[PDB]
Design a protein around this ligand. Structure first.
Ligand SMILES: Nc1ncnc2c1ncn2[C@@H]1O[C@H](COP(=O)(O)OP(=O)(O)OP(O)(O)=S)[C@@H](O)[C@H]1O
Ligand SMILES: O=C(NOCCO)c1ccc2cncn2c1Nc1ccc(I)cc1F
Ligand SMILES: [Mg+2]
Lengths: 229, 278, 306, 280, 229
């Protein structure tokens, strides 16, 4: 039964534990049945939390290592954390992408849901692209570029300028241009275009985003101001 | 009238004239003249301090509530929950974000602007007399040295110099004029506050000789080392700090100029986070 | 009848000529008057060119109920009678429900009664017919009672039309108006004041009281003293209400009015609603038979008194 | 002196005399007499309202900052961020915990105690005139009907009754005395505030006839249905509410009595719960 | 080297990850060297946070279990999940007591340290006491009872009435009396006595611990005002 699994995952999400939740959702997707709209946000939620934790401890190791600037086992441990929490970070994202192509790629009826699946893929690939430096990391960046372009086409085709998902794709793709792309000109132009699109569906804010869409516009203003600063 | 009939106030704990936590229509702060025979000098002190507070009603001036005479001379003000700026910055080393630090600057300036606008010179502005009420609102307090500018130059007469040295302007220290205080001397003190805000430390930390600091600052030899500002400090703030700290008092910004570098900074320097992921 | 038909035709024509309604659509011409919670403006609806009366009623209300008020006012689009002021549309902007309605250039009988001092029994006859037909119209074709009949809510125009306005069509608007400021007088029936009864019988009382006010040319505050009746600080509203409830109804002076008129207002003002004449009974009343049959240049009397 | 020289104030938006959000040494609230020719009655109104505010300095009275004459007659006060108690309770239906509700009661009482102590009767206390500033501090405002008790009974004269009916005491409605206002009438209004606080609704929700409410309350027929208090309402509060609402004004306790009862009920209803494993 | 381990544990504490921290501190104590004052509070923070996350999970899962009030497989699945949480909760506390009674309590030269470790032992036994319901309750309840009595004797002997540790022992022992044994009369007497002897030396409050002392003080007052109702 599926409903026992989704109640178990939802209950574990209410208990602020994101290991039993991720295991339960991987066990859901391993069945290979197509999700609903509701059962998907739970999967992204735990995955997003895991990505955030990887950025958080790994990010702390990054800045902490710079502060040391010595040559020791404390410094060795900072390097060790880059190899280890980074390897832990790598294992989580590879499990996500394997559960994505294996289950999410196989079943998808809603075209909007496809954008969410492609937006998630670009997110996890970009995070990986941001983390590692080299040729494999460059390949991951290329993978995220193709994924976000594929999502951007369907967003420009069959989405609303005020929907949450198109706004989120514009947001993630703009911060991809700024941080991985390292360009403030094109990134600010893209953010401005996304804000204009969100404003341009005033009637479609009411169902797709409205207050959430306004918050996304505020985030674009924050990003744009920072990049123009 | 703001005289609180005797008996109503209920003095409690002590904190640091002398200041107690009391009770009068809720938590209040009670500042008392401990002694029993008030000299006519301590009397005029009281009369003057009350006189100044009476003219203040602004969210960044600590709220005067009333005074008592009969038990002891005392000033009653709002109680504050939360610590002084001194305490945050040098005791519990609160890790404020730069936008917050700028905002504390902003509010402190707002309260000072309001006082100067009614011709009150505070004369004892410093970290300790700036309270972050509920951690969100700057209330400037302690008006024990506050004074109102007299239109006439001969009313001044003789007052023994008192105050904390780290915030005293060189002209005040030197004490060469009949009246060396000015709006500009208050600005200088606020300048030292910017210093604490943008650096995290008091000035002259290598010098522990009290008389030496008085002598070297008054003479022009010594002045705050602006290089100690933390790297996230907006260039506009560093400049604004150096301007408030100018040795030539007229050089330091005043009234509209004071509400220009800080007001201009307020409409600028924002957002330390570029995150947008949702 | 033909004239009223043509008027309704023109109204529907302008209705179809226009479309939706919103605050930008309007230009203020003048202030037609104000009351306890509402303001009325003579305005020009820019898209259509129509001159209309715009009533604003201040209300702080949930979106769900404001929208329910609008939706319920849309029933007026069908309310078509020469005894009922016309309806162009309704909306909510800023902090205020707007009702846009047939501009009546003659004003309210309240305004008129100020300039005319007293209204001639013969004109009041036409008014009494107009009110009854309108109350009948509302009752039968729209299931509703007026609630608020009084001189300021009977409106008259150049073409001699007497129409009713400000009646209780949106039930939600009635509800939302209950949180209100205190009035200075009242036309409320005693049985309503006591929560004892609630029907058209109560609107009949108010018409009755209105008539006496319009006839004598003075509002009802425990009638008038022996001296005051020869010529022809205000009583607080609680005292007025206490009067209405506990004292005999007002009545017309003895000689100045026909016995038929005196009898007519009397059957409208009987304290007990049961014993109070109804619309059927009033319609065939001596005073109504007479007045119906009389021909009066009402439109002429109106313009001559302004 | 508190006259603000002309030009300094910078009027902006509108909210609801008439009230604007303006600018004068920061955000302020500006309350203006829109019109152009101030009648000597509107003038004494202004003079009186300013007169009262001048005597207030307390954290629960909304902070009077100064007045202007020349452009229009206006009163300047602190700006408030955050909503009225009316707005929290009946618009956005804020789900306050009972300890918070008690505290709002407490602070409102504190501000009223302070006014009465200086002989000011507010005369228009109600949910709308109680602001939860920064969601944490009750500031009582709108002193447009406020007055100071005169030692002499013949100074009163004639004033046309005005105010919101739901908060008017029966004796005020009846308006039989030369002066039916008292500290006790303010208490009654505060009584209705307790009602909104402990029930979540205004009184007389089944009645929508304005004149009927005035008539039935003034007569003694109508009074708030205390059964509608929510079940988490401390018994001491229900009693205290019923006492503030007594029809016989002299039976209503004053601000000192409210202070006497406001502390003990809050102490009795402790919000402490769970209590196990504290990091400290 | 020890200092690399304590820097690694402190760095992981700054990153809000309490698994690598607990593993690093267990690896510290496995060396079998005596801790400082500083290295001890880290260990208590780690093994407090780990049990606390599971405690919050247990509480909210049990409240849902009392909330459902039907007859289906949700209750069986939820009860099974609660049993799994107890099994995880049980494993953590057993690891703590095994790391405690084999390297730290029998080698404890400072009597203040003995009060500390005995306070921790009574705490973790209470942690096990609240969750295991049956015959095995009466063992750990008496075990915590002996541990807290042993700590209370040394507190009454050679501690200050204003020290943080004696205050914490009084606090934990009072909530033990109220929740486990349900004799609120002796808990009321105990907390009132500890609070009154806490008043005596109010003048003797040095900068090393003012925040802790007044924090346990107001917590004691809050528990008292809850219980006297
Ligand atoms: N369609 C209209 N055309 C011309 N004048 C109007 C129109 N509607 C209202 N007025 C005038 O606006 C004023 C108020 O009339 P009403 O809307 O009926 O309210 P009211 O009779 O004053 O009752 P209160 O005191 O507000 S409870 C009156 O002076 C009307 O004559
Ligand atoms: O207008 C009203 N009261 O007067 C305001 C106080 O000044 C009023 C009152 C109740 C009501 C219920 N349903 C509509 N209601 C009103 N409005 C209204 C009704 C018919 C027409 I034609 C035009 C109108 F504006
Ligand atoms: Mg009306």
């Amino acid at each position: 039964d599926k409903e026992e699994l989704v109640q178990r995952a939802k209950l574990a999400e209410q208990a602020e534990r994101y290991d039993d939740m991720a295991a339960a959702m991987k066990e859901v997707t391993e069945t290979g049945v197509e999700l609903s709209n509701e059962e998907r946000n739970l999967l992204s939620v735990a995955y997003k939390n895991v990505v955030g934790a990887r950025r958080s401890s790994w990010r702390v190791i990054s800045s902490i290592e710079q502060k040391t600037e010595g040559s020791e086992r404390k410094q060795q441990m900072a390097k060790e954390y880059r190899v280890k929490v980074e390897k832990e970070l790598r294992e989580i994202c590879y499990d996500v992408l394997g559960l994505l192509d294996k289950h999410l790629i196989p079943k998808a009826s809603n075209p909007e849901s496809k954008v969410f699946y492609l937006k998630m893929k670009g997110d996890y690939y970009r995070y990986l692209a941001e983390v590692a430096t080299g040729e494999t990391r460059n390949s991951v960046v290329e993978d995220s570029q193709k994924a976000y372009q594929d999502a951007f086409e369907i967003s420009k085709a069959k989405m609303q300028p005020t929907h949450p998902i198109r706004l989120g794709l514009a947001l993630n793709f703009s911060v991809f241009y700024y941080e991985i792309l390292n360009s403030p000109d094109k990134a600010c132009q893209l953010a401005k275009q996304a804000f204009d699109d969100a404003i341009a569906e005033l009637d479609t804010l009411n169902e797709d985003s409205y207050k959430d869409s306004t918050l996304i516009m505020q985030l674009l203003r924050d990003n744009l101001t920072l990049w123009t600063s | 009238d703001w005289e609180i009939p005797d008996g109503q106030i209920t003095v409690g704990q002590r904190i640091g004239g002398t200041v107690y936590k009391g009770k009068w229509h809720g938590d209040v702060a009670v500042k008392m003249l401990n002694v029993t025979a008030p000299t006519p000098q301590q009397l005029q002190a009281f009369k003057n301090e009350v006189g100044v507070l009476r003219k203040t009603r602004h969210v960044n001036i600590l709220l005067f509530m009333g005074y008592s005479t009969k038990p002891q001379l005392a000033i009653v003000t709002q109680w504050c929950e939360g610590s002084s700026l001194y305490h945050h910055l040098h005791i519990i080393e609160t890790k404020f974000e730069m936008i917050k630090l700028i905002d504390i600057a902003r509010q402190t300036a707002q309260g000072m602007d309001y006082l100067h606008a009614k011709s009150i010179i505070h004369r004892d502005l410093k970290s300790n007399n700036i309270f972050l009420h509920e951690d969100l609102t700057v209330k400037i307090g302690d008006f024990g040295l506050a004074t109102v500018k007299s239109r006439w130059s001969g009313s001044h007469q003789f007052e023994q110099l008192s105050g904390s040295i780290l915030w005293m302007a060189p002209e005040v220290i030197r004490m060469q004029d009949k009246n060396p205080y000015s709006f500009q001397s208050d600005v200088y003190a606020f300048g030292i506050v910017l210093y604490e805000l943008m650096t995290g430390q008091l000035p002259y930390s290598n010098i522990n000789n009290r008389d030496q600091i008085i002598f070297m600052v008054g003479r022009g030899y010594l002045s705050p080392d602006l290089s100690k500002v933390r790297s996230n400090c907006p260039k506009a703030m560093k400049r604004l700090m150096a301007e408030c700290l100018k040795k030539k008092r007229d050089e330091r910004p005043l009234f509209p100029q004071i509400l220009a570098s800080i007001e201009l900074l307020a409409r600028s320097l924002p957002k330390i986070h570029r995150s947008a992921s949702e | 009848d033909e004239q009223q038909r043509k008027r309704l035709e023109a109204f529907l024509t302008q209705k179809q000529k226009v479309g939706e309604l919103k605050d930008d659509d309007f230009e203020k011409i003048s202030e037609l008057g104000a009351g306890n919670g509402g303001v009325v403006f003579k305005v020009s609806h820019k898209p259509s060119g129509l001159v209309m009366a715009r009533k604003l009623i201040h209300l702080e209300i949930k979106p769900a109920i404001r929208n329910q008020i609008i939706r319920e006012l849309q029933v007026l689009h069908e309310c078509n009678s020469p005894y009922i002021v016309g309806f162009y549309g309704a909306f909510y902007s800023d902090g205020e429900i707007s009702i846009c309605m047939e501009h009546m250039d003659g004003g309210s009988l309240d305004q008129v009664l100020k300039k005319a001092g007293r209204i001639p029994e013969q004109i009041l006859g036409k008014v009494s017919i107009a009110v009854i037909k309108g109350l009948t119209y509302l009752r039968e074709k729209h299931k509703i009672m007026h609630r608020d009949v009084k001189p300021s809510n009977i409106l008259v125009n150049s073409r001699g039309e007497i129409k009713l306005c400000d009646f209780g069509v949106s039930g939600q608007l009635i509800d939302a108006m209950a949180n209100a400021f205190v009035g200075t007088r009242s036309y409320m029936s005693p049985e309503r004041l006591q929560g004892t009864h609630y029907s058209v019988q109560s609107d009949i009382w108010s018409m009755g009281l209105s008539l006496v006010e319009m006839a004598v040319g003075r509002y009802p505050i425990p009638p008038p003293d022996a001296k005051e009746l020869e010529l022809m600080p205000p009583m607080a509203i609680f005292e007025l209400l206490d009067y209405i409830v506990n004292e005999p109804p007002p009545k017309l002076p003895s000689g100045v009015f026909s016995l038929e008129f005196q009898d007519f207002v009397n059957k409208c003002l009987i304290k007990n609603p049961a014993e109070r004449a109804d619309l059927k009974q009033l319609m065939v009343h001596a005073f109504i038979k007479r007045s119906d049959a009389e021909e009066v240049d009402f439109a002429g009397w109106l313009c001559s008194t302004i």
